[PDB]
Design a protein around this ligand. Structure first.
Ligand SMILES: Nc1ncnc2c1ncn2[C@@H]1O[C@H](COP(=O)(O)OP(=O)(O)OP(=O)(O)O)[C@@H](O)[C@H]1O
Length: 529
RNA sequence: GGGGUAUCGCCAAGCGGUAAGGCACCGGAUUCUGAUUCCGGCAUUCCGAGGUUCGAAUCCUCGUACCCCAGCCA
């Protein structure tokens, strides 16, 4: 429960409504992100909990900023999260003939007019936050004149910016949005849905309330920057012949630590090629999080945990990571992979190898097991052999023993350097019966694997507040390693998360991996202490 | 000028009856993953000052801090 669900309960109880009908109205000017997922979980979640309906509506009122690629991808991500919309996909452009008719109704009532103040002059006449505005010299044209000039606008007789339709409200209102807001403006631009049928396009505040009213939306839920705009949402519906009046309720937006939500900024990261694309694993977009290894269920759990309030907030990345670690700790089958290898030969080992049994999940025997090859020459991680180390360090020291994961207790004996002080091969002796711990991969059976270790895209907690957010990009947000994985990962598929024991959760990147060389993205590292 | 918001490091419940829960953090048990799991600890106090009340985070003052609005963007 939250404040909006308490409102909906009061509405049903009082008998104001019998059903709830919500909507998610994204403009198709970019890809969806985790902030949009908070609005999807809210709107579609309420609709299914109350056995109501929720429409997907593309708020496509500005052609020069939108593209068909984005309507295809938004539909893809809404479904991926596990949500279904009511009836067909809706568009604000489906109501363009309807919106034009309601504009003519406002003109016939004298509550709208064609203004010819230039784009800079409308700002001059609008007043400021402390000073009231002033009436346009074209504000008092007759109904018959506004009708002729609006038809001329629709016919293409005016150049862009040379005229616009305005609501006649109050230029001295304390709400800047009620100081004669523009209803229509001219754009000689092709629309991804309606082609070149229209050269006049409606503004958001005129489009949104009428679109909600025609769809029978009961509770229109948007973010806090639209609280002022609610006054125009209600003025439009109180002045046209429409039978219902949807109510707008605002909640605070999601801000995530170490990342930007702004589609203007996300588009600059894509355009200037600082990330691979909109679905790059470092992106906060839904498709980026999917390719990183996040499950839809972990994102729905995140939205459930952060809540819906009116408080400005900034969630820590630790909260997001906790959600996917919880899911994947349960469902991801374990495997062995070494990200930074160093060779370890066991001089004491006799034969060409054997086959050891390893659990697909240490705390769940029902997930089964598999046979993994052991050998004399294995690969371990460099960080697990310390030539000299204190009592806290429980891994392989040049003096003592360690347990190999699910295999033998070996024992460091002699290291062998190269020339530049670095180690090339460790020499150990195993104990034929011994069945901390370190993970390993037999060199003879090792699959060569490319591992992509991701970190936060920015080096500061609020890159949005920076003067240049690009100059605060983390240079180590992607470090590519070449390691070795156990041979069973040959049958790994994209969109299947594995826990590489003692490293984290990884998944096959479906963009860079082949059969000749797999690529594993690191979704999230394990809890390191 | 107007619209909004203040409760733990971050997020959040609470609607006149004695400050839930999650993430993070500090312990301590068990583990062939420094993981998981378990156990326990984390707000005498709610933006501040005053008032009402037997009793106030809730009510009433008066202050303060922060967020949003001056696109022919959404
Ligand atoms: N960060 C966010 N947190 C919560 N809801 C959000 C967030 N960003 C957008 N929404 C909601 O999702 C819906 C669609 O947003 P929309 O597609 O118009 O993009 P936008 O982020 O609002 O603007 P822009 O495209 O310029 O970034 C709106 O109801 C909006 O309030």
């Amino acid at each position: 429960t939250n404040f909006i669900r308490q409102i909906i309960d009061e509405d049903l109880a009082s008998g104001k409504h019998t059903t709830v009908h919500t909507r998610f109205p994204p403009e198709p000017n970019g890809y969806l992100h985790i902030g949009h997922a908070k609005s999807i979980c809210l709107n579609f979640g309420i609709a299914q909990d109350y056995k109501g309906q929720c429409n997907l509506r593309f708020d496509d009122t500005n052609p020069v900023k939108e593209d068909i690629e984005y309507v295809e991808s938004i539909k893809n991500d809404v479904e991926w999260l596990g949500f279904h919309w009511s009836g067909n996909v809706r568009y604000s452009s489906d109501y363009f003939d309807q919106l034009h008719a309601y504009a003519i109704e406002l003109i016939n009532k004298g509550l709208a007019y064609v203004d010819e103040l230039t784009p800079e002059q409308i700002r001059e006449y609008r007043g400021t936050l402390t000073q009231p505005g002033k009436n346009s010299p074209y504000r008092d044209r007759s109904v018959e004149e506004n009708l002729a000039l609006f038809e001329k606008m629709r016919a293409g007789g005016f150049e862009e910016g040379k005229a616009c339709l305005r609501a006649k409200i109050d230029m001295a209102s304390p709400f800047i949005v009620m100081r004669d807001p523009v209803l229509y403006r001219i754009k000689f631009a092709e629309h991804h849905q309606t082609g070149n049928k229209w050269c006049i396009y409606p503004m958001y505040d005129f489009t949104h309330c009428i679109s909600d009213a025609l769809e029978g939306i009961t509770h229109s839920l948007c973010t806090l920057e639209f609280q002022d705009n609610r006054r125009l949402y209600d003025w439009v519906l109180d002045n046209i012949t429409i039978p219902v009046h949807p109510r707008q309720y605002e909640f605070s937006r999601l801000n995530l630590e170490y990342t930007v939500m702004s589609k203007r900024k996300l588009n600059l990261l894509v355009t200037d090629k600082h990330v691979e694309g909109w679905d790059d694993p470092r992106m906060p977009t839904i498709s980026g999080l999917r390719r990183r290894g996040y499950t839809a269920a972990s994102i729905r759990e995140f939205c459930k945990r952060i809540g819906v309030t009116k408080q400005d907030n900034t969630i820590e990345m630790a909260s997001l990571e906790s959600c996917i670690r919880e899911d994947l700790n349960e469902n991801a089958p374990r495997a062995m992979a070494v990200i930074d290898p160093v060779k370890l030969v066991i001089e004491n080992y006799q034969g060409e190898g054997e086959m050891v049994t390893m659990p697909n999940h240490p705390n769940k025997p029902e997930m089964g097991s598999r046979q993994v090859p052991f050998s004399g020459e294995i690969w371990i991680d460099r960080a697990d052999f310390r030539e000299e180390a204190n009592k806290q360090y429980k891994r392989l020291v040049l003096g003592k023993e360690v347990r190999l994961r699910n295999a033998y207790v070996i024992k460091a004996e002699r290291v062998e350097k190269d020339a530049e002080g670095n180690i090339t091969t460790i020499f150990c002796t195993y104990d034929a019966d011994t069945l901390g711990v370190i993970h390993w991969v037999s060199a003879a059976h090792a699959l060569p694997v490319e591992i992509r270790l991701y970190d936060r895209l920015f080096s500061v907690p609020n890159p949005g507040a920076a003067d240049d957010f690009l100059s605060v990009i983390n240079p180590e947000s992607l470090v590519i390693k070449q390691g070795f994985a156990e041979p069973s990962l040959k049958d790994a598929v994209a969109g299947k998360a594995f826990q590489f024991e003692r490293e984290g959760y990884f998944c096959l990147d479906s963009r860079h991996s082949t059969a000749e060389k797999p690529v594993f993205n690191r979704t999230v590292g394990l809890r390191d202490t």
